[PDB]
Amino acid sequence: IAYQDMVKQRGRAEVIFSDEELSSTIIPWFIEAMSEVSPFKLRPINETTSYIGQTSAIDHMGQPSHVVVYEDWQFAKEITAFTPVKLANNSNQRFLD
Amino acid sequence: ASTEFAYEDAYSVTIRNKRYTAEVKEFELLGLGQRRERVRILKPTVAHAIIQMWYSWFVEDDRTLAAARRTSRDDAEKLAIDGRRMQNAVTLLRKIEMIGTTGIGASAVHLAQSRIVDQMAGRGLIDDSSDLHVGINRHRIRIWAGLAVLQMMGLLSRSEAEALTKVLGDSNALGMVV
Amino acid sequence: GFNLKVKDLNGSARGLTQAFAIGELKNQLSVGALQLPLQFTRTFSASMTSELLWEVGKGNIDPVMYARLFFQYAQAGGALSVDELVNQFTEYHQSTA
Numbered sequence: 134i135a136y137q138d139m140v141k142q143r144g145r146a147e148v149i150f151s152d153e154e155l156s157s158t159i160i161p162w163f164i165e166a167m168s169e170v171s172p173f174k175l176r177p178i179n180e181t182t183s184y185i186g187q188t189s190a191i192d193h194m195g196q197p198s199h200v201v202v203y204e205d206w207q208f209a210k211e212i213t214a215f216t217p218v219k220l221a222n223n224s225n226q227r228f229l230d
Numbered sequence: 231a232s233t234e235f236a237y238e239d240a241y242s243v244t245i246r247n248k249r250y251t252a253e254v255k256e257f258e259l260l261g262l263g264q265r266r267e268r269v270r271i272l273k274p275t276v277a278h279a280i281i282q283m284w285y286s287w288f289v290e291d292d293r294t295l296a297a298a299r300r301t302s303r304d305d306a307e308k309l310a311i312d313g314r315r316m317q318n319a320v321t322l323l324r325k326i327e328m329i330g331t332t333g334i335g336a337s338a339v340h341l342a343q344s345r346i347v348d349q350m351a352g353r354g355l356i357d358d359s360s361d362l363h364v365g366i367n368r369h370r371i372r373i374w375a376g377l378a379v380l381q382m383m384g385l386l387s388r389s390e391a392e393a394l395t396k397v398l399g400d401s402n403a404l405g406m407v408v
Numbered sequence: 409g410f411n412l413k414v415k416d417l418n419g420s421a422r423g424l425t426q427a428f429a430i431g432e433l434k435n436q437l438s439v440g441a442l443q444l445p446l447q448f449t450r451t452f453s454a455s456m457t458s459e460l461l462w463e464v465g466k467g468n469i470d471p472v473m474y475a476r477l478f479f480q481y482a483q484a485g486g487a488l489s490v491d492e493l494v495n496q497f498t499e500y501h502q503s504t505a
Contacts, residue, residue, distance in 0.1 A: 217270060
């Protein structure tokens with residue numbers, strides 16, 4: 134999908150041409166860059182859609198009249214309420230009571 | 231990522247060709263004094279997104295269901311549409327009203343009535359307050375309380391809840407039903 | 409020096425009717441025949457006629473005296489409420505201590 138995004142905006146794809154070698158030896162670290170630091174951490178495609186359900190309405194035979202895709206979500210538990218306290222002026226440092 | 235915690239709202243009503251209006255404050259809804267302005271609320275971005283799922287159905291449907299009745303000349307097609315419109319409109323009312331009875335919602339309703347009746351003692355006879363307990367005004371004050379409690383939490387934008395009411399009023403959407 | 413006519417209370421002084429105090433402002437007044445008994449031995453009242461000077465010590469940090477003063481502060485002239493007076497102290501005391 135990222136390729137699609139890129140090619141939409143760029144309209145071309147150009148290379149540093151340091152390959153065939155360079156980016157094969159240096160870097161896979163594109164992988165390392167992706168592995169540790171990022172919040173996007175790598176998952177099996179099985180375990181990504183675990184929260185999604187799907188349900189069809191129907192007619193007599195039947196083909197669906199109404200089809201609804203959803204994410205199973207849980208509400209609550211609490212709603213937090215606080216008063217911020219500034220320890221030093223000009224800064225965002227705060228205790229939140 | 232957080233929000234200033236304050237809310238103001240007012241329920242208005244006409245009784246015997248006379249209008250009384252009560253305004254209400256957040257700390258009053260939680261039954262305390264005086265008021266502490268310094269406190270804030272953590273925005274419930276998650277919870278809000280869920281109720282949105284409801285909201286976007288109601289409004290976007292009614293909107294498209296309206297433009298549907300214009301393009302539909304056929305009377306058999308039209309009698310179904312206005313059915314579905316009113317149908318889920320009452321479901322909305324049934325929902326909000328349900329919230330209107332809550333720790334806050336009922337505490338909300340009491341405050342309005344209290345301030346209205348105290349308003350009814352001075353301005354004239356109180357005896358007209360009998361009308362507040364009539365079927366419709368009672369359902370009226372309840373819905374309001376419902377939308378008001380939702381707003382005084384991160385759950386309802388005032389801009390979207392107003393546009394929610396327009397849906398509820400665009401279709402008459404009150405079966406009085408005894 | 410408040411004068412009132414005893415026959416009609418609601419007319420003379422509405423404010424002193426018990427009827428008012430419990431929240432019935434309607435023509436209806438409390439029904440003279442109803443149920444259950446009681447006797448009051450004691451009550452909670454403040455003192456009249458007292459003007460006192462209270463020293464605040466070297467130390468000694470009298471935990472009641474301050475809590476007593478806070479009340480006198482909110483009382484003897486309005487400063488919010490003695491509830492709102494405390495959570496002001498917490499924010500000061502957090503921002504400082």
